[PDB]
Amino acid sequence: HIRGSITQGIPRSY
Amino acid sequence: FTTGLVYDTLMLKHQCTCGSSSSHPEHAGRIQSIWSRLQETGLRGKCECIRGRKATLEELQTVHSEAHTLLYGTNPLSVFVRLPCGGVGVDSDTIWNEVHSAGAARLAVGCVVELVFKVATGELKNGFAVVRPPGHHAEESTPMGFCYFNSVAVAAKLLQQRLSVSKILIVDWDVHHGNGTQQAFYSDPSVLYMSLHRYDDGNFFPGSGAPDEVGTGPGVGFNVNMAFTGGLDPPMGDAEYLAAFRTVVMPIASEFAPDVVLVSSGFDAVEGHPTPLGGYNLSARCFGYLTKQLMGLAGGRIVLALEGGYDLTAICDASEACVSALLGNELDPLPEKVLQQRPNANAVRSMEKVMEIHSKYWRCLQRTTSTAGRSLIEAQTCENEEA
Ligand SMILES: [K+]
Ligand SMILES: [K+]
Ligand SMILES: [Zn+2]
Ligand SMILES: [Zn+2]
């Protein structure tokens, strides 16, 4: 599914 | 004929209801503190006070789908989830105030548009928009990364459609890639989108913005991702961004030769940030020099619009330096260590990758060899002897 977070610096993926 | 500033305290009302201050980095105090810094330093008094307004739904639809503009630009007179903080949002990053967020987001766009048009028509020399929520991550029908509407992209579309501006340069020096802005102009050769960002081979938010993303169709070559890769080993700093401006940004921008320059001016690359939010070590003073470099384009017709940047001291320091530069004030000299520093190996590799790719499209990059490894002193020493 969708993950990703600007607060954590994690890219959006899947 | 001076620098304009736009700001509106109604943008402070875009705020989560949860009461958990440490949970939301994109908070009202960001623009409130910047405005106070501009006031107490005397810079506001040197500028023209520009009144903002809400963007219309039709103006928003130059970039976003009708459904997107209705969802986030109007209130009931689901895409919204209950967040663990207790508030409502569209994802864990991006809060929604059911009373105030639609108006605040439309006001951010309208403030940027008002300022951009006054500069473009010659009522102002240049300007800085102190606005929130930020805009450059919002895609045609997807909010994300604190953004709902892409204020800078809307302003550019309106310049095209209402003033027939034939060449627009957008520089995005927020530490994050502006995926929304890239999307909005990807096939358009009349708008050059240039982003400097932490990219790290796709392992940083939002994950887009690879150097080989150059545009599509007639827009091929008019999308330039100055993507830094290598992580924080070491973090990018003044020497690296100044070298990137010397080798990539300013040669391409000068060859593009724009009519207007728009800057997505996030300050989350400034030193003092939590590393997951940026982790770079730019000085606020450096952003004044970067502003002064861009002021050499388009006859000085330039507008900066606040995007990200979260540490209050950092974004106030950088806003002060940028507005001082827009006013034509002399900037403090960069430290000797900065002028003498060679850009780190990761930044050199990153710059040379971008130059190799875009040498296919830009004659200024059909230069002899790469000078990306030179310090500012080393580059200026070789410039004076040449000319
Ligand atoms: K950027
Ligand atoms: K483009
Ligand atoms: Zn909350
Ligand atoms: Zn950012």
Author numbering:
A (entry chain A): 1358 to 1371
B (entry chain G): 652 to 728, 744 to 1053
Task: Cite, word for word, the article reporting this structure.
The HDAC domains of class IIa HDACs repress the respective target genes by interacting with the C-terminal region of the silencing mediator for retinoid and thyroid receptor (SMRT) repression domain 3 (SRD3c). Here, we found that two conserved GSI-containing motifs of SRD3c are critical for HDAC4 binding. Two SMRT peptides including these motifs commonly form a β-hairpin structure in the cleft and block the catalytic entry site of HDAC4. They interact mainly with class IIa HDAC-specific residues of HDAC4 in a closed conformation.
For the SRD3c protein, we designed two peptides (SP1: −3HIRGSITQGIPRSYV+12, SP2: −2KEGSITQGTPLKY+11), which include the GSI motif in the sequences. For kinetic analysis of peptide binding to HDAC4c H976Y (R651-T1055), we performed ITC experiments and obtained a dissociation constant of 2.23 μM for SP1 and 18.8 μM for SP2. Overall, the refined HDAC4c-peptide structures superpose well on the apo-form structure, indicating that peptides binding did not rearrange the catalytic and structural zinc ion-binding sites. The bound peptides commonly form a β-hairpin structure of two β-strands in the HDAC4c cleft leading to the catalytic zinc ion. The hydrophobic I+3 residues (I1363 or I1459) are at the β-turn near the catalytic zinc ion and intervened with F812 and F871 at the end of the cleft and entrance to the catalytic pocket of the HDAC4c. At the two loops of S744–W762 and H803–G811 of the structural zinc ion-binding site, D759 hydrogen-bonds with the hydroxyl group of T+4 and peptidyl nitrogen atom between S+2 and I+3 in two peptides. Notably, D757 interacts indirectly with R+9 of the bound SP1 via a water molecule (w8), which is missing in the SP2-bound structure with L+9 at the corresponding position. According to the determined structures, the SP1 R+9 residue interacts with the structural zinc-binding region (although this interaction is water-mediated), and SP1 I+7 and SP2 T+7 are exposed to solvent without interacting with the protein, suggesting the greater importance of the SM1 R+9 residue than the I+7 residue. Interestingly, HDAC-binding activity was significantly decreased in the SM1 R+9L mutant (SM2 mimic), whereas the SM2 L+9R mutant (SM1 mimic) exhibited increased binding activity. The reverse SM2 mutant, an SM1-mimic L+9R mutant, showed increased binding activity to HDACs, which was comparable to that of wild-type SM1.
